Amino acid sequence: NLAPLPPHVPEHLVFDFDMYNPSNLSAGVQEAWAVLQESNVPDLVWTRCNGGHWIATRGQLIREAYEDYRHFSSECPFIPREAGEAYDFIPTSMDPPEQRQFRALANQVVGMPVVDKLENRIQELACSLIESLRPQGQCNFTEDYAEPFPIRIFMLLAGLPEEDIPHLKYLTDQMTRPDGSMTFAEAKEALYDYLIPIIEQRRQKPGTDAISIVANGQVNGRPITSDEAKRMCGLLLVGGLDTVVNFLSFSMEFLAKSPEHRQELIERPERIPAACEELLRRFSLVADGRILTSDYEFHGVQLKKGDQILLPQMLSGLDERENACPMHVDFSRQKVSHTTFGHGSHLCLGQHLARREIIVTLKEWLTRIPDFSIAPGAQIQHKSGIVSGVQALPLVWDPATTKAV
Numbered sequence: 001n002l003a004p005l006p007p008h009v010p011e012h013l014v015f016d017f018d019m020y021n022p023s024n025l026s027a028g029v030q031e032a033w034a035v036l037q038e039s040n041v042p043d044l045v046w047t048r049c050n051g052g053h054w055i056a057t058r059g060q061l062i063r064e065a066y067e068d069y070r071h072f073s074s075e076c077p078f079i080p081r082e083a084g085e086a087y088d089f090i091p092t093s094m095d096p097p098e099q100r101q102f103r104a105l106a107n108q109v110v111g112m113p114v115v116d117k118l119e120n121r122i123q124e125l126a127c128s129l130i131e132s133l134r135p136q137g138q139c140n141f142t143e144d145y146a147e148p149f150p151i152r153i154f155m156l157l158a159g160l161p162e163e164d165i166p167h168l169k170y171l172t173d174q175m176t177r178p179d180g181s182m183t184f185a186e187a188k189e190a191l192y193d194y195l196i197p198i199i200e201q202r203r204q205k206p207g208t209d210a211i212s213i214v215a216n217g218q219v220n221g222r223p224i225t226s227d228e229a230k231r232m233c234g235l236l237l238v239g240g241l242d243t244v245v246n247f248l249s250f251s252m253e254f255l256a257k258s259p260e261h262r263q264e265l266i267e268r269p270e271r272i273p274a275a276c277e278e279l280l281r282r283f284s285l286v287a288d289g290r291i292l293t294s295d296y297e298f299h300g301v302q303l304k305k306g307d308q309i310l311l312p313q314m315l316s317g318l319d320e321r322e323n324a325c326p327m328h329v330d331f332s333r334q335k336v337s338h339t340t341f342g343h344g345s346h347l348c349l350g351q352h353l354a355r356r357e358i359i360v361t362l363k364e365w366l367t368r369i370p371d372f373s374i375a376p377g378a379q380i381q382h383k384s385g386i387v388s389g390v391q392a393l394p395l396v397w398d399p400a401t402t403k404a405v
């Protein structure tokens, strides 16, 4: 379903990319998207899918657009429009200077100092899940570790019941990798139905959890409204549940296929941080956009007020102008260039959390299970969307090569 080309779109800039179902998904999600960076694709293209929208293809342009909130607004950050429209998360659907107060608050909940406080638990949980798997010689990494790990840590941070995981996870999924089962607004309303009562309760009888801290916060000298808290937490949930989960699967899928990369980390552990960055560049997985507030000529292309443009954070670090041999993993690149956690005023607040979770997993898994691979005759399927994913990751290993710690 291709929408008729708008009058202002030069036909030579058309390139029908479907962000939800790119062409050679078989090859991998990042490979599927990287087709946008082949020599035959202009820097800025218009696609007819998903109702019609611009896509910037190069790191240079993604960053500029992200810096420029005057022209590129976060008011409608998701494609298709109805989703971007229904989208009312904070601080994500806001521009500076308004955005800045809400951010300062979310920072209170997820920033560095929270991570540092939670460090021991993160380690405790990782060690426990891993040790628990070790003797089996086989898992479903996606259901077995990648979901539980990040998700339990969040449920802990938020002070919410683990029991709610399945329901929540479904709703969060519908948002980033729409199934067709429920529309964005519906999905938004259900999560919101979840949260409302919860917020009500923590406004009355505050705890020490993230939700209590948000429900009772100050923004611009005055108190946050019930709607504002619902809208902040809503975001906290989607980042909590859906980002780290997918990243780990990509990373582990790669590790499973590359013995020499594993060994490298085993023997020269001082490289883990460097490797974490490189993996963040290569298996980048978020693609959102902005809305043109007005008519604006950008790198010689005329954008019309109201036009949406996808600025794939995934793409920057995959761009050959930014990283020589992009599709190659090299733990010792001089410079790892990416915008995995975004760029501009919306830079990921949960970055410190994400990094800490990634580093622990690598260190801890490799410690106990140094040698592993993908299950014979398993065909790994990636999924595309706002947040890209892995459907399932069947791993196998020989117990006898594992190390109890």
Ligand code: HEM
Pocket: 077, 090, 091, 092, 103, 106, 110, 235, 236, 237, 239, 240, 243, 244, 247, 285, 286, 288, 289, 313, 340, 341, 342, 343, 345, 346, 347, 348, 349, 350, 351, 353, 354
């Ligand atoms: C692999 C991990 C993650 C990746 C790749 C990631 C990616 C991103 C991206 C690309 C943005 C900017 C979106 C925009 O500019 O439209 C963002 C913002 C955000 N993320 Fe992260 N995210 C990750 C983990 C997390 C975690 C663990 C949390 C906390 C629960 C979270 C919470 C946030 C918040 C609150 C914002 C918005 C900040 C603002 O608008 O000022 N993210 N993230």
Ligand SMILES: CC1(C)[C@H]2CC[C@]1(C)CC2
Pocket: 092, 176, 235, 238, 239, 243, 286, 287, 288, 386, 387
């Ligand atoms: C990954 C994201 C793009 C960041 C802002 C919206 C989202 C879908 C959750 C956290």
